Ligand binder design. Structure first.
Ligand SMILES: CCCC[C@@H](O)C(N)=O
Ligand SMILES: CCCC[C@@H](O)C(N)=O
Lengths: 147, 153
């Protein structure tokens, strides 16, 4: 379900990994469609954090794993479409769509996300995704801020 | 300033500094936002351009981009821009930042957490997209902006 948005950089290189950190993050993006917190957590450092910016952050591998496990109980990531990826000293940015399905309603939405990852020695010390939560809630008829 | 570092920001100070010509242009642009002046800001844009605050509709072309910025500035003021992380590759610049925004109708302020992307060619902006949660911002400054600036777009 990976349609280009109109504004995407036309060079296909803009969406491809050209550094070891970009390569790890693209592999991580590939893994997201497993909807499997236990597989995902292997990419993370000990001193780490995760935040979907409209919701509270999680600090440390255990809390990150439990947050993801809880997300996957109410929604599934059916596809991940990465348009732009860039890296520089320890940070990787991804502009993407995650096609998300709300399990209670069966409804899907193409969630526009800009995400940032911090790495050290090939492991994720931070992951933050920025998007508009209300629009997703209304598309899939489900209030997530409560949950 | 009004610039507090989040807990999670990369500790090396290099992470928030420009080290490419594209990064430097984008930081100058970020410095200009506190002008609250759409006519000044439009100078940084290419002809084939676009702007989008991602919870609202995109604007295509310089006049629409200028009108969108002008519309925002009729009702809010950017009091400060705090850039934590800046990176560029491949004609793209990314900025992780907080904009301290004050809603003019209510007088209330909010530290809006933003991740934005810029596309550039020959030193001009061909695309600018800012990602953030609009509802949190509306509820903080007691202003339904989507209701207002949604129809506007
Ligand atoms: C609350 C929406 C969460 C979205 C997130 O799981 C993703 N990266 O798609
Ligand atoms: C609708 C909120 C827009 C936020 C934006 O003006 C910004 N600070 O760049």
């Amino acid at each position: 379900k990976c349609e280009q948005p109109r504004w995407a950089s036309k060079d296909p290189a803009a969406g491809k990994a050209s550094t070891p950190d970009e390569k790890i993050v693209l592999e991580f993006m590939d893994a997201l469609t497993s909807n499997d917190a236990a597989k995902l957590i292997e990419y993370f450092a000990e001193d780490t954090m995760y935040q979907n910016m409209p919701l509270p952050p999680a600090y440390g591998r255990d809390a990150v794993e439990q947050t993801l496990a809880g997300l996957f109980k109410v929604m599934s990531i059916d596809a991940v479409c990465v348009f732009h990826i860039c890296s520089c000293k320890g940070l990787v940015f991804t502009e993407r769509v995650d096609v998300l399905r709300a399990l209670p309603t069966g409804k899907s939405y193409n969630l526009s996300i800009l995400g940032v990852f911090q790495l050290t020695d090939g492991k994720i010390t931070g992951w933050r995704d920025y998007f508009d939560l209300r629009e997703f809630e209304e598309a899939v008829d489900l209030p997530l801020r409560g949950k």
